[model samples]
Target: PLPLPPLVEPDASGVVKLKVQTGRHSFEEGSEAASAGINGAYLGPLVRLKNGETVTLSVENGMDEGTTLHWHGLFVPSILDGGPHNVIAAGEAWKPEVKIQQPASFNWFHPHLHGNTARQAHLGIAGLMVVTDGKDAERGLPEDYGVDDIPLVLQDRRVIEGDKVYEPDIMDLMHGFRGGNLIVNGIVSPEARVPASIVRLRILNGANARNFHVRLSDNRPLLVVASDGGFIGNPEPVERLTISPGERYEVLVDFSKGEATDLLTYGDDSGGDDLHLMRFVVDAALQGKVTKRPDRLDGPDAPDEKLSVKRRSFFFDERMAENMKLMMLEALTSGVEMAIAGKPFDMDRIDVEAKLGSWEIWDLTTKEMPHPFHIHGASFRILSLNGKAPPAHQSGWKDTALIDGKAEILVHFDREAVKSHPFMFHCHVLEHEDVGMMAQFVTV
Candidate 1:
């Protein structure tokens, strides 16, 4: 397996200053594609930050085009959220101060430029960001990187000749572009040599369109510790889990039986493969070590009925005729358009107004395909899926979730939004988000 990316730690003043650069790099051995990344080459460094630390990222765009670096699952002020509005031109830099306020979770960074997010990320402008809380480390889960604790950024890419492809046509935008090849942590086929023990896998579905239905080859049980936001009150036992684009899942797999196995993904609706994602070579089992799973993971609060101040409903699809007309008239011919609640995104308008610190129940539905709904500024609890209670694993905090069916969630925000900077809610599909299947809101 390719070595795990190096960790970027904060200095004495609680600031991690990185000259984040983006440009072309080679992914395949012989074919150098037109890729973009941070610091080094394709993909980027693993940024390790602690809770409550102040992170100041000096992001510089070195490509000929402009881009915005969005912290996919972090709690930050609206101005620093790095949405499409905050664009860094080709030689310009973006220095935003982010005050970390949430628990440790596996987050990520990627470009959020309008009309180009899919192609930029498809060419490899992405990286991993990990926040570690003091309390969670005491739980005895895997902590060592490149060893027991593994960070897998799963992505699928289209390759032509010997290089990864980046050009996207009209149909590629209509249906989110799914690559023909599967890559884990920037490599084609990867295998990790690990000691036989319980390993904690921090997996991010970082693809543009592919939804991964992950399962182990030997029918081994997976202990689900956390979702996009953080831990579910306890570990969830599951045979398989489906993770969509922009979603993160942390799972534990016990390889103590001393058997080598391949971690595979079952087929999803996309004509994708049910193939091996990575291989695990279990060397030897540790003697006399306790492998019993922990019972409790977090202390979560119930969504108080009295706190429910607003109930809203929304639909994500190509419901706007104007957008369809625009797509039909565009240079990219015969493509589909996207809208939220039958409205395309407007940069100056606030689509919704939310009360600060007040709970609300949201009913979200999608059509034609599954859309992974994501809310910025806060995480939420799933109350129901398709009018019924959600499964045990989905009851935890999540900023992004697959709307396989209609979903109702209890949510709230602690931070207020300014007129110049509002929070975003949209489909996690990069193509859809760039094409305007999105909305903005403010908490007063």
Candidate 2:
């Protein structure tokens, strides 16, 4: 079943043109291989903007090599924030313009090309970018998009004979490239139908390294309402929820119990078993028109105890001293090298500057595993995690999280506040962010 991912409206002059191709497809069913989309065939297109609108994306890279397009959480304006400095060569067309301003979120877009961005988003580019507001349609929710508002983009690959493969090796490069199949918007076992009642699940864990944890073979509960920035002032039930790799969440699946089940995820058990992924059916006659939910849904954004906060402290692990393998031998990411406090990434160097309106408190932490932490342009607020406080469905606003241990955010450098243009705080996996961990800062 799995179909939706082909809705790209916006024309009153708001633009939204696109291209980036490189065909082949097959993802299994027949056997094709080679892929890369943005203009259709595999994945890309499921947009919808409107909160203050001003959009105008006009991409176009017929792809021969260079490609960079990142809007992961959308706060735009670090020179359009495509990262990797923003390259669109090989046929060329660029043209970014954003201005949606935020608030009704669930953003995403892939390929941040720099050592191939995890093989060009696992050879399929990527999509989804919803952003609505008008009080999100009078705040009734689940306004139906593909059926009670759904989106789900989760991913994972590594086939062999039928196609979909990425290579990886070297223990998938010191640990990161873990695939095998489990996809969901580019389809693999996906199935949908829902409408026994409140549906609305935006999902989006785009996976470059996996880490789901979700659940629901009739377990129920999950509710949530938003994460990664948007909604969430109410509905926060939870029973599973883990999500990683560029995180995003906006659940609410009560299926109204019409029948059929299975939504499983439960990865990380290591041996890999329960991963059904999707298959909802439901709908005996419920049809959804929003039968509940909405106790509040829009708080957070009022923290100004006089401003000036700044207080950093990272430690993503792996060499903060010792040999360092001779300064990573000019590493620009080859297989995976990882490092954050012991330094590794340095596209031009500029680890932290802070100023453009100030208010920081980072304090992240990690061992040798968990690390989703993303940040580009701004969006945070989860003042603690292993230190407590942080469960009102993650205490509102966030750009990405999954530290697995310690995590104390609170950032917010206020919009374009630029000083030359530099923004990025990585490890959203993409193969451990092209193997160098990552770090770039500058808000002055």
Candidate 3:
């Protein structure tokens, strides 16, 4: 059976407290793996937030090392963004009060330590965050938690001697980490017993680098209702959907036929073969609870080209020569430094500046492999992909997007980020991020 993280809700005063600790998790029955989690032995809880309310998140670090917990898809001030700049040292606590202003969506939180993100997250320091607005309850969708509505944290890990491992080789460093075992909610090949109705799966591609091309065994359509930021204008059904690192999607699958099926992933960009992620067993007794599917949804408005006042371009280049030189010079180093726009990440430097409430157009391109680009503080509308319109499933607001070639986005800076605590934009692949495919910007 699949494991469900305990749900943590805000108190009457709208305060949510979390504690990070280290523990040993057993992936297999008798094998234990060193892991870190928030308020649990492995992984964290399902944090439930409400829109139009102010909440204080009190995060305490009980681990022996320093770390930072970042809200992956929230539109908060940079000081409250929980990027690498906001590190919570061991035995310390950091609290940030934020007002939830965005729409109800599926989001997540994970450690964002500068050179150890992949290691910490791979060892189990991540959790799900769901925002609600009291309107989704009336949409006739699956509202029951751990029943018809399921939150699946999809990750891949290398298992050695029945224990999860994080040893990356040369190829793994150049590309991102790829594991042999598929894990859902901290377990391997878990089974989900769903109602014989329309079941909603809130999926988070929490892997360090792998991209999941999710599809049903019978090739049934997966109705995509929401993207990284929030819900789309309508549910777009696709035969298969590719979810990259740091990306989230809410997909609905009909199990009315009551037949057993497996949720599988086709070939991924990480060179992974087809694998079964989870098995779905529907029971006839658990039927008719949620039968209606949402036809339309309330999402962000379409982007207006005329609203964009400035334009900028970013080039993600893999400097092989420089990398080889650095590799030899720093052979003992744990992390490498990649570049974006010919320069690596500098914590003291501000790459770009924008005025609050301004609109800008950003052009993104990558040299070799595809990279999932993510920006902090705001979500944007994708204008085009490879100079062509994006598919229906991607025609929604996004904070993280897979950029194989040329892509453009229209961004509105609605939040304020000071120079002291700027927002970061980088490749979603954790290894790439730690190696410096990241930059920062400030909005005044």
Candidates' lDDT values, in order? 0.76, 0.76, 0.84
Per model, state how many residue pairs clash. Answer: 0, 1, 0
lDDT per residue (tens digit) for residues 149-268 in model 2: 888888877762344467775456555787767878877787898888888888888867788888888788878888878876776888788888878888887777577787888767
Ranked by TM-score, the better of candidates 2 and 3 is 3
lDDT of 1 at 184: 86
- The alpha-carbon lDDT assigned to residue 422 of candidate 3 equals 88
How do all the candidates rank in terms of lDDT, highest first? 3, 1, 2
- Highest lDDT: give the candidate number: 3
Better of 1 and 2 by TM-score: 1
Expressed as tens digits, the lDDT of each residue in 1-444 for candidate 3 is 999989999998788988988887866556777777889867899999889888899899998888888998877888887867778888999989988988788999999867678888888898888889988767767878988989998888886233446776655666888887888888888899988899899989998898999888998779999998888887899988899999999999989888899889965666466798999998777655777788888876667879998999998866666666755711126455686645878888899898888999999998779999988887788999999988766878888999998999998788788988888888888878777788888986
- What tens-digit string does per-residue lDDT give for candidate 1 at 142-224? 77777778888888878723344666666666667787667788877688877677788898998988888888888898888
Clashing residue pairs, candidate 3? none
lDDT of candidate 3 at residue 49, scale 0 to 100: 89
Candidate 3 lDDT: 0.84
Give the TM-score comparing model 1 with the true structure, all chains together.
0.92
Runs with alpha carbons beyond 4 Å of true place in candidate 3:
160-164, 270-272, 325-335
